[PDB]
Amino acid sequence: TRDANGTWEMESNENFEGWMKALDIDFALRKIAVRLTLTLVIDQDGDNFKVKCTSTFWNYDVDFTVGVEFDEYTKSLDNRHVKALVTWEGDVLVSVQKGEKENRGWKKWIEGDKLYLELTCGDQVCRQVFKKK
């Protein structure tokens, strides 16, 4: 339940639009984002993670070390400066992004070959499920 390595293909994605709207993403761009196939590629070695989300028009790449706060600029998303921190809460991988938005971050539950991802911003939660390819 703690190994997130691999290429992860989307199976479900609920309230993607509400989460993007909470981040203030342009309405026009949200309507395209909702159509795009998203692939999550994770390289995990000890505390070190390299995460890459890919689609036809936008990528989102982040590298981090568990337990080490990092300055982050969401240049390809909402373009904000946040102080990010990723930690283990049991077998749940938890990101908090401190900044303008409240309740901002994500949580990842790895259950064998399924990855459950909950992205939060403000009062919005988007729930995604991926399957390991």
Ligand X SMILES: *C/C=C/c1ccc2c(c1)C(C)(C)c1cc(N(CC)CC)ccc1-2
* Contact flag: residue 40 with ligand X (CB under 6 A): yes
Out of 41, 66, 77, 94, point to the residue binding ligand X (CB under 6 A): 77
CA nearest to 109, candidates 26, 29, 8: 8
Distance of CA 9 to the CA centre of its chain: 14
Out of 84, 85, 117, 121, point to the residue binding ligand X (CB under 6 A): 117
Out of 6, 105, 106, 124, point to the residue binding ligand X (CB under 6 A): 106
Out of 60, 66, 109, 129, point to the residue binding ligand X (CB under 6 A): 60
- Piece of the chain touching ligand X by CB under 6 A; list 47-55, 64-72, 97-105: 47-55
In this structure, the strands spanning 124-132 and 6-14 are antiparallel
* Contact flag: residue 38 with ligand X (CB under 6 A): yes
Out of 64, 108, 118, 120, point to the residue binding ligand X (CB under 6 A): 108
Are the C-beta atoms of residues 40 and 53 closer than 8 Å to each other?
Answer: yes
With a CB cutoff of 8 Å and minimum separation 6, the contacts of 132 are 6, 7, 8, 9, 113, 114, 115
What residue number has its CB nearest to ligand X? 53
As beta bridge partners, residue 109 has 116
